[PDB]
Design a protein around this motif. Structure first.
Motif, PDB file in Angstrom:
ATOM      1  N   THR A 108       0.810  -1.218   0.000  1.00 25.04           N
ATOM      2  CA  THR A 108       0.000   0.000   0.000  1.00 25.04           C
ATOM      3  C   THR A 108       0.845   1.271   0.000  1.00 25.04           C
ATOM      4  OG1 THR A 108      -1.747  -1.154   1.186  1.00 25.04           O
ATOM      5  CG2 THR A 108      -1.810   1.270   1.224  1.00 25.04           C
ATOM      6  N   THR A 109       1.914   1.330   0.810  1.00 25.73           N
ATOM      7  CA  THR A 109       2.570   2.603   1.096  1.00 25.73           C
ATOM      8  C   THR A 109       4.014   2.699   0.628  1.00 25.73           C
ATOM      9  OG1 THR A 109       3.387   2.025   3.327  1.00 25.73           O
ATOM     10  CG2 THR A 109       1.100   2.829   3.152  1.00 25.73           C
ATOM     11  N   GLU A 110       4.650   1.598   0.231  1.00 26.13           N
ATOM     12  CA  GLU A 110       6.059   1.641  -0.169  1.00 26.13           C
ATOM     13  C   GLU A 110       6.113   1.868  -1.678  1.00 26.13           C
ATOM     14  OE1 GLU A 110       9.346   2.310  -0.811  1.00 26.13           O
ATOM     15  OE2 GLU A 110       9.497   1.522   1.236  1.00 26.13           O
ATOM     16  N   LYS A 111       6.474   3.091  -2.089  1.00 22.02           N
ATOM     17  CA  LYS A 111       6.486   3.409  -3.516  1.00 22.02           C
ATOM     18  C   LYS A 111       7.450   2.518  -4.298  1.00 22.02           C
ATOM     19  CE  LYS A 111       6.364   8.260  -3.683  1.00 22.02           C
ATOM     20  NZ  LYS A 111       6.682   9.545  -2.993  1.00 22.02           N
ATOM     21  N   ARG A 112       8.524   2.044  -3.662  1.00 21.91           N
ATOM     22  CA  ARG A 112       9.473   1.189  -4.363  1.00 21.91           C
ATOM     23  C   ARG A 112       8.875  -0.156  -4.760  1.00 21.91           C
ATOM     24  NH1 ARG A 112      14.455   1.171  -0.436  1.00 21.91           N
ATOM     25  NH2 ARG A 112      12.682   1.533   0.978  1.00 21.91           N
ATOM     26  N   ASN A 164      -2.866  -0.946  -5.636  1.00 18.69           N
ATOM     27  CA  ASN A 164      -1.479  -1.206  -6.006  1.00 18.69           C
ATOM     28  C   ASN A 164      -1.270  -2.662  -6.400  1.00 18.69           C
ATOM     29  OD1 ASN A 164      -0.848   1.459  -5.633  1.00 18.69           O
ATOM     30  ND2 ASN A 164       0.151   1.185  -3.641  1.00 18.69           N
ATOM     31  N   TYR A 165      -2.027  -3.584  -5.799  1.00 26.03           N
ATOM     32  CA  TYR A 165      -2.028  -4.963  -6.276  1.00 26.03           C
ATOM     33  C   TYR A 165      -2.393  -5.009  -7.752  1.00 26.03           C
ATOM     34  CZ  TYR A 165      -3.426  -9.873  -6.811  1.00 26.03           C
ATOM     35  OH  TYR A 165      -3.590 -11.152  -7.274  1.00 26.03           O
ATOM     36  N   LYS A 166      -3.496  -4.350  -8.119  1.00 23.18           N
ATOM     37  CA  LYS A 166      -3.947  -4.376  -9.506  1.00 23.18           C
ATOM     38  C   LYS A 166      -2.931  -3.711 -10.428  1.00 23.18           C
ATOM     39  CE  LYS A 166      -8.948  -4.379  -8.571  1.00 23.18           C
ATOM     40  NZ  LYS A 166     -10.136  -3.468  -8.464  1.00 23.18           N
ATOM     41  N   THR A 167      -2.352  -2.589  -9.994  1.00 25.17           N
ATOM     42  CA  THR A 167      -1.344  -1.916 -10.810  1.00 25.17           C
ATOM     43  C   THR A 167      -0.143  -2.821 -11.045  1.00 25.17           C
ATOM     44  OG1 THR A 167      -2.051   0.264 -10.053  1.00 25.17           O
ATOM     45  CG2 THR A 167       0.220   0.070 -10.931  1.00 25.17           C
ATOM     46  N   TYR A 168       0.322  -3.501  -9.993  1.00 25.58           N
ATOM     47  CA  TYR A 168       1.453  -4.408 -10.155  1.00 25.58           C
ATOM     48  C   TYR A 168       1.106  -5.559 -11.093  1.00 25.58           C
ATOM     49  CZ  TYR A 168       5.626  -7.089  -8.975  1.00 25.58           C
ATOM     50  OH  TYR A 168       6.832  -7.771  -9.041  1.00 25.58           O
ATOM     51  N   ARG A 169      -0.103  -6.117 -10.955  1.00 23.14           N
ATOM     52  CA  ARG A 169      -0.518  -7.230 -11.800  1.00 23.14           C
ATOM     53  C   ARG A 169      -0.495  -6.832 -13.266  1.00 23.14           C
ATOM     54  NH1 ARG A 169      -0.465 -12.312 -11.056  1.00 23.14           N
ATOM     55  NH2 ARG A 169      -2.465 -12.655 -12.141  1.00 23.14           N
ATOM     56  N   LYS A 170      -0.892  -5.597 -13.566  1.00 24.32           N
ATOM     57  CA  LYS A 170      -0.889  -5.142 -14.953  1.00 24.32           C
ATOM     58  C   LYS A 170       0.530  -4.939 -15.465  1.00 24.32           C
ATOM     59  CE  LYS A 170      -3.886  -1.902 -14.038  1.00 24.32           C
ATOM     60  NZ  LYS A 170      -3.140  -0.644 -14.367  1.00 24.32           N
ATOM     61  N   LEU A 171       1.430  -4.460 -14.605  1.00 20.68           N
ATOM     62  CA  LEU A 171       2.836  -4.309 -14.981  1.00 20.68           C
ATOM     63  C   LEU A 171       3.526  -5.652 -15.174  1.00 20.68           C
ATOM     64  CD1 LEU A 171       3.985  -1.469 -12.509  1.00 20.68           C
ATOM     65  CD2 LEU A 171       3.715  -1.258 -14.985  1.00 20.68           C
TER      66      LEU A 171
END
Length: 269
Positions: free
Chosen positions: A107-111, A149-156
């Motif tokens: 949720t909070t770690e931009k890295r 952020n889960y969904k964003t990572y999954r798309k990446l």
């Protein structure tokens, strides 16, 4: 003191802790908003079954341990949160098969969305829930709302398996911790480290656990990759459970920080 034998306790953990992930059939992850995001194949088809596995804590006592060769001599290695191998391989090893992350990180770690270290192996994220909440109730108010952020990572990274732990599992483990250490237990969920141990006991025949029980290198440095003390670095009954189930020698704890726990597939109940 713990009232069950090690053998009875392993059976109790095997039968009472459901190590499973959220599935596409679990409402509301079957809504259109979630279409295509969760892995359709179970983690048990992608992860093992394995013979010998390692769990590597993130503890500062891994620094200068030179455990890297011992750690890499396994079928699979589990690590936690953002723990890196780069620049530490001689101490912590080179491979990362499973990475268990708390929802605060996602949720909070931009890295998390930038650093390549996350792109290796199988990812699991878990979020603390209200005790005895089911999936639809937990979904309405996660501890950290990691879903975007889960969904964003999954798309990446669509071809990296990335599972969500069911909310019930940490509290099922907590129940057993309470049963054996009732006067001392705190109402926090089990640590990620304890969850990772039980996860690997589900996928492996033997689990070597490094620097969860501290070695002679025990230190107040929280993380082996820490550069100085800050807000990130300012429980006995989990360590006692692991000690109770340990089949390795006392010298291996002191010298290597190593405990060895048999996996669930190999036990008789």
């Amino acid at each position: 003191g713990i009232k069950f034998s090690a053998e009875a306790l392993r059976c109790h953990l095997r039968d009472h802790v459901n190590v499973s992930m959220v599935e596409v059939t679990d409402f509301p992850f079957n809504t259109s908003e979630w279409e295509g995001y969760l892995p359709k194949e179970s983690i048990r088809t992608k992860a093992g079954p394995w013979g010998r596995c390692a769990v590597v804590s993130s503890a500062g006592s891994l620094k200068s341990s030179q455990l890297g060769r011992e750690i890499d001599d396994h079928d699979a290695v589990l690590r936690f949160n953002g723990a890196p191998t780069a620049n530490f391989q001689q101490d912590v090893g080179t491979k990362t098969t499973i990475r268990l992350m708390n929802s605060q990180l996602v949720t909070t770690e931009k890295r998390f969305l930038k650093d390549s270290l996350y792109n290796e192996g199988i990812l699991i994220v878990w979020d603390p829930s209200v005790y005895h909440s089911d999936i639809p109730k937990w979904y309405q108010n996660p501890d950290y709302n990691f879903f975007n952020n889960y969904k964003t990572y999954r798309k990446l990274h669509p071809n990296q398996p990335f599972y969500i732990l069911k909310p019930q599992m940490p509290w099922e483990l907590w129940d057993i911790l309470q049963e054996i250490s009732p006067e001392e237990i705190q109402p926090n969920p089990p640590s990620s480290g304890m969850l990772g141990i039980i996860i690997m006991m589900t996928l492996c025949d033997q689990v070597d656990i490094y620097e969860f029980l501290p070695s002679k290198r025990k230190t107040d440095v929280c993380y082996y990759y820490q550069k100085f003390f800050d807000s990130a670095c300012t429980l006995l009954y989990e360590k006692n459970l692991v000690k109770h189930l340990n089949q390795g020698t006392d010298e291996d704890i002191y010298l290597l920080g190593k405990a060895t726990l048999p996996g669930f597939r190999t036990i008789h109940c």
